[PDB]
Amino acid sequence: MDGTYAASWLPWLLIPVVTWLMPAVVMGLLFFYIESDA
Amino acid sequence: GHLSTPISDSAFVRSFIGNLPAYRKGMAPITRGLEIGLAHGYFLVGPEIIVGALRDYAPAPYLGGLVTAIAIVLLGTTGMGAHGLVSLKPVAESSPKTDALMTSEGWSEMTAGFFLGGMSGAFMAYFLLSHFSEIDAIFRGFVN
Amino acid sequence: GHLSTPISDSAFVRSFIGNLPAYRKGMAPITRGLEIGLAHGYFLVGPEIIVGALRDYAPAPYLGGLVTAIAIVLLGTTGMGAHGLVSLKPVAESSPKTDALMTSEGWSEMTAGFFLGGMSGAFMAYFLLSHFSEIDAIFRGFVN
Amino acid sequence: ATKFPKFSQDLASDPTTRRIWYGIATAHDFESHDGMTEENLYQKIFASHFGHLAIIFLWTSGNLFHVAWQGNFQQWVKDPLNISPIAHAIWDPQFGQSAVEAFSQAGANYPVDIAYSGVYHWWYTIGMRTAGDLYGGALFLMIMAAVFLFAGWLHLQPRFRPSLAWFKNAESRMNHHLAGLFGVSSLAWAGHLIHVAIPESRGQHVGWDNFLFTPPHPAGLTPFFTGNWGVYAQNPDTASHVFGSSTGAGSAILTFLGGFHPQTESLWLTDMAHHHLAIAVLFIVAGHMYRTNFGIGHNMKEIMNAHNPPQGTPFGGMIGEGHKGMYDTYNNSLHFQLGWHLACLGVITSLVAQHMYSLPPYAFLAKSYTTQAALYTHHQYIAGFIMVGAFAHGAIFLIRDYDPASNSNNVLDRVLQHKEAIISHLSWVSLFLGFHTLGLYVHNDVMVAFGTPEKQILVEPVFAQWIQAAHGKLLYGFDTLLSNPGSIASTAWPNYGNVWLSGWLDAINSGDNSLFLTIGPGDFLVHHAIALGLHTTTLILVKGALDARGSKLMPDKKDFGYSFPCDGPGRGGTCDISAWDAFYLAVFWMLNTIGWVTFYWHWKHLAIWQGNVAQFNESSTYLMGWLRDYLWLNSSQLINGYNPYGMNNLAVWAWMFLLGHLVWATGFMFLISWRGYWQELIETLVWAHERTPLANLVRWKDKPVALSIVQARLVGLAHFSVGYIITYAAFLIASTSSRF
Amino acid sequence: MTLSETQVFVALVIALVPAILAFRLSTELYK
Amino acid sequence: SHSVKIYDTCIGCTQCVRACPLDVLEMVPWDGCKAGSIASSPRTEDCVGCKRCETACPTDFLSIRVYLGAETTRSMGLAY
Amino acid sequence: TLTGKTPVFGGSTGGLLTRAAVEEKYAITWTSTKQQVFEMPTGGAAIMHEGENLLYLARKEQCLALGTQLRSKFKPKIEDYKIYRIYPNGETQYVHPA
Ligand code: CLA
Ligand code: CLA
Ligand code: CLA
Ligand code: CLA
Ligand SMILES: CC1=C(/C=C/C(C)=C/C=C/C(C)=C/C=C/C=C(C)/C=C/C=C(C)/C=C/C2=C(C)CCCC2(C)C)C(C)(C)CCC1
Ligand SMILES: CC1=C(/C=C/C(C)=C/C=C/C(C)=C/C=C/C=C(C)/C=C/C=C(C)/C=C/C2=C(C)CCCC2(C)C)C(C)(C)CCC1
Ligand SMILES: CC1=C(/C=C/C(C)=C/C=C/C(C)=C/C=C/C=C(C)/C=C/C=C(C)/C=C/C2=C(C)CCCC2(C)C)C(C)(C)CCC1
Ligand SMILES: CC1=C(/C=C/C(C)=C/C=C/C(C)=C/C=C/C=C(C)/C=C/C=C(C)/C=C/C2=C(C)CCCC2(C)C)C(C)(C)CCC1
Ligand code: SF4
Ligand code: SF4
Ligand SMILES: [Ca+2]
Ligand SMILES: [Ca+2]
């Protein structure tokens, strides 16, 4: 995986952020929202 | 009620399971989580070492098993921690004599223990496999 | 009394700050300190990596950021620990329902958590930067 | 009770996992929520529409940004016939190194996807030429989306919250949307084509720097006021014009040519400018029809009340009376409006598909075969989903909003009274078409299999061939109007204003475009299969809507709602009796219908593009030819996207092809196996967790239950539909882009 | 030619203002 | 819970009360039919929604109707 | 608060779960003239005693299905069964026959 487009280091960071960190954070926050009592 | 079986009426099974660190009487919750974490992070390095993507990668044949076990211990810690936050009540809002893993501070003590044991058990297994040629010289006496 | 502002009457601000690990209800103090420590030791490696004295030192370009973050976490732990020793009273010499961070054992539990999270968050950031060429091959698929 | 869902106290007290599922599924049914007043309903819908608009503008902005950042738009405009467009770059760390080289295509040295949406052909025709052009377009849609996001937040603030009467003022909404949203936007688009797109089509760079100083015409607006507008219809772009340069370029800005530009095989840009100016005038004046507080105009209510007989036929009479109270039937019911606005949008979405392939509006779109295949199938499947949802919300209106007291013996009351005549007549047309279309196919199959392909029944479609001859096609030799050179319609006798006619007959007799293709006996049978699919899907949807309030099996069906499982095994058994269940059955028939539509479009075009139109003409009359010469034959390069000898760029479509077969088949589990099997299975799993040491320390918050009867019909239909779409989309793109 | 590294970074900064405004509309539609 | 409604067309044949596996229904003296009894539904919070009562009702249309409402642990038939 | 003999039964996997301890419970008492064999509503054969019997079950439907078996499957019939709803605090509410 490499790119010659401008700032090709951005998919290096953003694809782990969008597909690992963001879903784990959103599923974590949605777990708190749908399982909180009262 | 329940069944009377030669597994349920087995005294070795009840003494083994009852003295696993989840159940062993008199343990603090931080120590329960620590012993559970050290066992679990240690074996979790192994699978990606032998059959993973970095098994034929000469610069770092062991890095894939370490970061796999770290991220599994991360999601295991966060899932265990989020579980106690939604399921349990603190020690103030419970009765006395309330079985500390059934309180939220005791469960989160166990969660902190699982993280610390899990990552460091994973780093321990990674460290021995990374230094395996020097462990092998120790175990064979090539260091004299 | 205080001001009624659109920051103070903001429900997202109060839910974010109130659920940071210093304030999040039901956490044990060891777990509060651990989460705070892991976040703080991790970023503290970074500055000496990029603009420090060992940034152009080929034998160890990352060692300067690690020992900087370790010594800051040491003085942060010792200052936090000495703070609780002079400021707070133990759980015996306090009333019931006494907000465990306001007791000396709860503050020192948080201090022990900050040390363990802080050094290991620092070692985690050091370990990824030291293995960055192998992390980059993982993240680009040069390991296939 | 729990927090989620906030809007339903009946669901928030549910102790099982059904609460989570139903809270997701009823979140946008705003009328069912607790304490929903009518104008809090309209205000939440209004702000929701601001959010949906901003999602569209961010979606377009991301299309422009990724083409500008990672595409090859500048290299593509130099040679749009052999450069493939780039959608975006690939970042997949799980790729092996021979997959990086297989996807490093379209003249790029990084892995890319070949775009098939047609955004290159669209942005090139409307005047964009550089990545800096698309980048400023991308930044502009991002601030526009931020404007609409702020506008939705602002119109929920208590001061700016609109009243209920502002939401029901239909005359002011139609005047502002005909004149402003339709007319001024079409007028401003004619302004873009004349000032920007037509100069950029003639080698002239026009941007924000110098568009105040380059006139669109050399005689600029001095002949517009004097009324001699024919000087704007000059020498057009000639038959030797090269698109994007001043070679062969005319100077006219508003022509009336017809047909296609001979290089691009696309519509003339000066016809599309004169189209958008002409309908802007028809829409701006139509926005000055209904009365507002300026004093005259029309009340929509009094027009419909006076249109009862009407009549110049009479026909007094039998129908109906009708049209009394249909203003407030329309205006009080949001489900009547949504069902009506989807039925109009569904006809228009399918009109987009049938016209963009035969009258291509974009330069070199008619030679990008995979893009043309993808665009037709996209807009026909979307039109099929929109059309079924028009009937779904028509049935929700009949349960929730329909008033038989107000609508008393009007047109809408009257269709329900002879509802057994409409359903039984739809049932006969469906049975007549299906018995005879399938019977003709099976008869031809037996003739070809027995070795006698001249005994098969080949009915020529003589009515639609006559329409092609009536529009100017000379291949069948009928010689009626517009193919008769001396007919009344071709000469256009008293005015002779037939300027389009020479361009039209040039394009309709060229045997190289998709404009009124030659049709034969294979085209006869598949139109009657399509008519079968249109009538059966209507039959399920109409009978679901007309029996939604009750039938003889369940007379009080409106008391139970739009969606409910059944009424129990009594009275013979009542599985799938609700009106939601007839939505559910009709999605199957819709997908089968659009399946037969897009199979036929693709095979006829793939036969034309391969230079063998006789393969369609010989094999489409029996069903083994469809299986062998269309499905089996064109699967070859797709399923070799990876094999034991390696992989190529079709490996993502091969993998998606198998994924689509898997999702489709997973849906069969939810559709065939039903609930009580799974609830008793989950009961043993609940037992095993509670009795397992070290795992019974972990307790669920919600009790695990099987999915409900309605939910797994929906989940099974969703897997069926998703597996239907991505299987064909993988096959359509890989069978067309492998040889083209 | 494609974008420069400054043009990509400007778009990421410009993307923050629909990101903040969608968050404001999200919490306003919820209540 | 579910809603069980008994209508004025009940003939007091008590077959819906015999058919109920959860003992939701009982007969109340009514004098509005020849039998003098009508079905009633006091314990609707124990109703599972099986509609065995509607299967047993011999009037056309049914004198007893079950409306499936908000789900509880009792109405979902859960032993856990 | 309720007397009666537990039926002779080796136990099974179909009986009470965590709900019986924390939410609600059910008991059915009946008096029998014979030491006979009946089918459990949770599966399996048990031995009822002469005199008062007492059986704890998870749901009300399981108790009423046993009472239907006590009526229709024995000679003579057993009508005198009583069903009680037991709460975790110990409050025992007599629910059938109401
Ligand atoms: C909204 C349409 C849209 C779509 C479908 C995509 C899709 C993609 N982007 Mg792109 N992105 C977009 C808009 C979009 N982008 C815009 C407008 C910008 C300029 C700020 C970017 C800037 C950008 C960068 C710098 C990169 C990507 C990348 C990618 C790819 C990997 C996912 C990712 O890491 O995104 C990252 C996402 C962002 C940086 C922010 C996205 C901002 C959009 C507008 C948010 C859209 C939210 C949406 C409307 C919510 C809809 C509702 C939801 C329920 C569906 C993926 C093909 C990566 C790539 O190209 O790999 C090869 C990558 O490195 N995008
Ligand atoms: C402008 C268009 C429009 C609008 C505003 C609405 C609005 C509405 N519809 Mg309607 N409808 C529409 C078009 C529209 N619809 C179309 C096109 C169809 C045909 C499909 C329907 C058929 C329909 C039915 C049968 C029903 C509604 C209902 C509703 C209401 C509630 C929706 C809800 O809360 O569920 C939220 C929706 C979901 C939770 C479903 C999301 C999942 C779906 C199945 C897509 C899954 C795709 C998947 C994510 C893709 C990933 C693939 C990948 C993994 C490989 C709401 C008023 C309901 C109603 O009014 O009840 C009385 C109702 O029963 N609609
Ligand atoms: C799920 C829904 C869906 C999706 C994802 C698509 C996707 C697509 N459509 Mg399709 N379409 C759909 C449903 C959909 N369609 C429906 C329901 C209709 C019937 C209305 C159409 C009718 C249609 C047509 C006629 C065309 C497309 C085209 C396209 C393609 C181009 C991308 C695009 O549209 O940019 C996003 C576009 C916009 C955001 C347009 C904004 C401009 C609006 C109309 C006017 C703006 C006026 C301005 C603000 C006023 C200023 C006035 C002032 C100056 C005075 C893309 C493949 C085009 C194509 O085939 O390209 C090859 C094309 O020509 N679509
Ligand atoms: C290929 C599979 C298939 C076939 C052939 C059919 C056929 C039919 N569907 Mg069905 N449907 C299907 C799949 C299919 N469906 C699926 C998967 C669903 C989703 C569950 C539906 C949901 C559905 C609905 C909701 C409705 C239909 C209706 C119909 C009938 C439409 C009227 C017609 O065209 O008459 C032509 C008849 C045929 C094409 C079938 C006859 C086949 C030949 C001629 C039989 C020859 C006799 C044979 C040799 C003797 C047997 C030999 C020996 C064992 C005795 C037709 C019988 C509609 C209906 O019944 O309205 C009247 C209707 O409302 N279907
Ligand atoms: C003890 C222990 C343990 C355990 C732990 C646990 C306890 C865990 C948990 C876990 C968890 C606790 C998890 C969670 C998860 C979650 C999830 C997975 C989520 C998801 C979500 C979603 C998916 C969402 C959805 C949605 C909604 C809701 C709304 C709308 C939107 C959407 C659709 C998105 C371990 C193993 C470590 C080890 C040893 C020790
Ligand atoms: C929570 C936390 C924290 C905090 C901590 C703290 C709390 C700290 C403290 C600190 C401290 C607590 C410090 C201390 C210091 C001290 C000092 C600095 C001292 C000095 C001294 C001197 C200088 C002396 C003087 C003198 C005298 C007195 C006498 C005579 C002689 C002489 C002059 C020498 C941190 C940040 C970590 C992080 C996060 C968490
Ligand atoms: C500062 C700075 C920067 C930046 C950074 C960042 C921070 C960025 C990123 C950015 C981003 C990361 C962005 C994001 C975006 C996002 C968006 C824009 C979103 C949207 C969304 C939406 C639109 C939503 C929708 C919705 C839903 C889904 C549901 C509910 C409703 C609503 C509609 C709301 C740079 C380095 C360049 C340069 C230097 C400085
Ligand atoms: C060819 C041609 C022509 C003709 C045209 C025509 C005449 C057309 C028409 C058209 C048509 C003829 C269309 C139609 C459509 C329809 C539809 C699409 C329907 C739908 C429906 C719906 C969906 C409904 C629903 C509902 C219900 C069911 C119930 C109640 C409610 C509602 C009403 C909503 C002309 C002369 C121009 C010339 C050129 C050529
Ligand atoms: S409701 Fe039906 S079954 Fe019950 S008593 Fe009345 S008629 Fe008989
Ligand atoms: S639905 Fe079932 S449980 Fe409810 S009253 Fe009828 S028979 Fe009894
Ligand atoms: Ca490898
Ligand atoms: Ca140095």
Coordinates of C-alpha atoms in Angstrom, one line a residue, chain D residues 183-394:
Chain D
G183 CA -37.7 27.5 -12.6
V184 CA -35.0 29.8 -11.2
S185 CA -32.7 26.8 -10.7
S186 CA -33.3 25.6 -14.3
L187 CA -32.8 29.3 -15.3
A188 CA -29.6 29.4 -13.4
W189 CA -28.5 26.1 -15.0
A190 CA -29.1 27.6 -18.4
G191 CA -26.9 30.4 -17.2
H192 CA -24.2 28.0 -16.2
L193 CA -24.3 26.2 -19.6
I194 CA -24.3 29.3 -21.7
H195 CA -21.6 31.2 -19.7
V196 CA -19.3 28.3 -18.7
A197 CA -20.0 24.9 -20.3
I198 CA -20.5 26.0 -23.9
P199 CA -17.3 28.2 -23.8
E200 CA -15.4 25.4 -22.2
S201 CA -16.7 23.1 -24.9
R202 CA -15.1 25.5 -27.4
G203 CA -11.6 25.6 -25.9
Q204 CA -12.3 28.8 -24.0
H205 CA -11.4 28.8 -20.3
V206 CA -14.1 30.6 -18.3
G207 CA -13.8 30.8 -14.5
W208 CA -14.7 33.1 -11.6
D209 CA -11.8 35.4 -12.6
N210 CA -12.9 36.3 -16.1
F211 CA -16.6 35.5 -16.6
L212 CA -17.7 39.1 -16.1
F213 CA -15.4 40.1 -19.1
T214 CA -16.0 37.3 -21.6
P215 CA -19.6 37.6 -23.0
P216 CA -21.3 34.3 -23.8
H217 CA -22.2 35.7 -27.3
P218 CA -20.5 38.4 -29.4
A219 CA -23.8 40.2 -29.7
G220 CA -24.4 40.2 -25.9
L221 CA -27.9 41.1 -24.5
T222 CA -28.3 43.9 -27.0
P223 CA -30.3 41.5 -29.2
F224 CA -32.1 40.0 -26.2
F225 CA -34.0 43.1 -25.3
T226 CA -34.7 44.1 -29.0
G227 CA -36.6 40.8 -29.5
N228 CA -34.5 39.5 -32.5
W229 CA -33.6 36.3 -30.5
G230 CA -32.9 34.3 -33.7
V231 CA -29.3 35.7 -33.7
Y232 CA -28.7 33.4 -30.7
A233 CA -29.4 30.4 -33.0
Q234 CA -26.3 30.9 -35.2
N235 CA -24.0 28.5 -37.0
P236 CA -23.8 25.7 -34.4
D237 CA -20.9 23.5 -33.6
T238 CA -20.2 21.9 -37.0
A239 CA -20.2 18.2 -37.9
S240 CA -16.3 18.3 -37.7
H241 CA -16.2 19.9 -34.2
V242 CA -13.9 18.4 -31.7
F243 CA -15.3 18.7 -28.1
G244 CA -13.2 20.8 -25.8
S245 CA -11.4 22.8 -28.5
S246 CA -12.1 25.7 -31.0
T247 CA -11.7 23.3 -34.0
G248 CA -14.9 23.3 -35.9
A249 CA -16.5 25.3 -33.1
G250 CA -19.5 27.5 -33.7
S251 CA -20.7 30.5 -31.8
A252 CA -24.4 29.8 -31.2
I253 CA -25.5 29.5 -27.6
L254 CA -29.2 28.4 -28.1
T255 CA -29.9 25.9 -30.9
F256 CA -32.7 23.6 -31.7
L257 CA -30.8 20.9 -33.6
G258 CA -31.8 17.5 -32.2
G259 CA -29.9 14.3 -32.6
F260 CA -26.3 13.9 -31.4
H261 CA -23.0 15.6 -31.6
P262 CA -21.1 13.4 -34.1
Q263 CA -17.9 13.1 -32.1
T264 CA -19.3 12.5 -28.6
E265 CA -22.6 10.7 -29.7
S266 CA -24.1 13.0 -27.0
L267 CA -26.8 15.7 -27.0
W268 CA -25.9 19.1 -28.1
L269 CA -24.9 21.5 -25.3
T270 CA -26.8 24.3 -26.9
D271 CA -29.9 22.2 -27.0
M272 CA -29.5 21.4 -23.3
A273 CA -29.1 25.2 -22.7
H274 CA -32.3 25.9 -24.7
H275 CA -34.0 23.1 -22.9
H276 CA -33.3 24.5 -19.5
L277 CA -34.2 28.1 -20.5
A278 CA -37.5 27.0 -22.1
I279 CA -38.7 25.0 -19.1
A280 CA -37.6 27.7 -16.8
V281 CA -40.1 30.0 -18.4
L282 CA -42.8 27.3 -18.1
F283 CA -42.0 26.8 -14.4
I284 CA -41.6 30.5 -13.4
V285 CA -44.9 31.4 -14.9
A286 CA -46.5 28.3 -13.3
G287 CA -45.2 29.6 -10.0
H288 CA -47.5 32.6 -10.5
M289 CA -50.7 30.6 -10.5
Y290 CA -51.9 30.0 -6.9
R291 CA -53.0 32.8 -4.6
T292 CA -50.9 34.1 -1.7
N293 CA -51.3 37.4 0.2
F294 CA -50.6 39.5 -2.9
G295 CA -54.2 39.2 -4.0
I296 CA -55.1 37.0 -7.0
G297 CA -54.4 33.5 -8.1
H298 CA -56.0 30.1 -7.4
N299 CA -57.2 28.2 -4.4
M300 CA -56.4 24.6 -5.0
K301 CA -59.4 23.6 -2.9
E302 CA -62.0 25.3 -5.2
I303 CA -60.5 23.9 -8.4
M304 CA -61.0 20.3 -7.3
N305 CA -64.5 20.9 -6.0
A306 CA -65.6 22.3 -9.4
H307 CA -64.0 19.4 -11.4
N308 CA -66.7 16.8 -10.7
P309 CA -68.4 16.1 -14.1
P310 CA -66.1 17.9 -15.8
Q311 CA -67.2 17.2 -18.8
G312 CA -67.0 17.7 -22.6
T313 CA -67.7 14.0 -23.2
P314 CA -70.5 13.6 -20.8
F315 CA -70.2 10.9 -19.1
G316 CA -72.2 12.7 -16.4
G317 CA -72.2 10.7 -14.3
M318 CA -71.0 7.3 -13.2
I319 CA -67.8 8.8 -11.8
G320 CA -68.1 9.6 -9.0
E321 CA -69.0 12.3 -7.7
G322 CA -65.5 12.6 -6.2
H323 CA -62.8 15.2 -5.6
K324 CA -64.6 16.8 -2.6
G325 CA -62.3 16.7 0.5
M326 CA -59.3 15.5 -1.5
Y327 CA -57.5 18.7 -0.7
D328 CA -57.5 17.9 3.0
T329 CA -57.0 14.2 2.3
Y330 CA -53.8 15.3 0.6
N331 CA -52.9 18.0 3.0
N332 CA -53.6 16.5 6.5
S333 CA -52.0 13.1 5.7
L334 CA -48.2 13.0 5.4
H335 CA -48.5 9.3 4.4
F336 CA -50.8 10.2 1.5
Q337 CA -48.3 12.8 0.4
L338 CA -45.3 10.5 0.8
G339 CA -47.1 7.7 -1.0
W340 CA -48.0 10.1 -3.8
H341 CA -44.6 11.8 -4.0
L342 CA -42.9 8.4 -4.2
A343 CA -45.2 7.3 -7.0
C344 CA -44.3 10.4 -9.0
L345 CA -40.5 10.1 -8.2
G346 CA -40.6 6.4 -9.1
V347 CA -41.9 7.1 -12.6
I348 CA -39.4 9.8 -13.0
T349 CA -36.5 7.7 -11.8
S350 CA -37.3 5.1 -14.3
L351 CA -37.8 7.7 -17.0
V352 CA -34.2 8.8 -16.2
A353 CA -33.0 5.3 -17.0
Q354 CA -34.9 4.8 -20.2
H355 CA -33.8 8.2 -21.6
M356 CA -30.2 8.4 -20.5
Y357 CA -29.3 5.3 -22.4
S358 CA -31.1 6.2 -25.6
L359 CA -30.5 10.0 -25.5
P360 CA -27.1 10.2 -23.8
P361 CA -26.5 13.7 -22.4
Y362 CA -22.8 13.4 -21.5
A363 CA -19.8 13.4 -23.8
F364 CA -18.4 9.9 -24.6
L365 CA -20.9 8.3 -22.2
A366 CA -22.4 6.2 -25.1
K367 CA -19.0 4.5 -25.6
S368 CA -18.2 3.8 -21.9
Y369 CA -20.2 0.5 -21.9
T370 CA -19.8 -0.5 -18.2
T371 CA -20.8 3.0 -17.1
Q372 CA -23.9 2.9 -19.3
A373 CA -24.8 -0.6 -18.0
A374 CA -24.2 0.4 -14.4
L375 CA -26.2 3.7 -14.6
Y376 CA -29.3 2.0 -16.2
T377 CA -29.4 -0.9 -13.6
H378 CA -28.8 1.6 -10.7
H379 CA -31.7 3.8 -11.6
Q380 CA -34.1 1.0 -12.5
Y381 CA -33.5 -0.8 -9.2
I382 CA -33.9 2.4 -7.3
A383 CA -37.1 3.1 -9.2
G384 CA -38.4 -0.3 -8.3
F385 CA -37.7 0.2 -4.6
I386 CA -39.3 3.7 -4.7
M387 CA -42.4 2.4 -6.6
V388 CA -43.0 -0.4 -4.0
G389 CA -42.7 2.2 -1.2
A390 CA -45.3 4.4 -2.9
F391 CA -47.8 1.6 -2.4
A392 CA -46.5 0.9 1.1
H393 CA -47.2 4.4 2.4
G394 CA -50.5 4.4 0.5

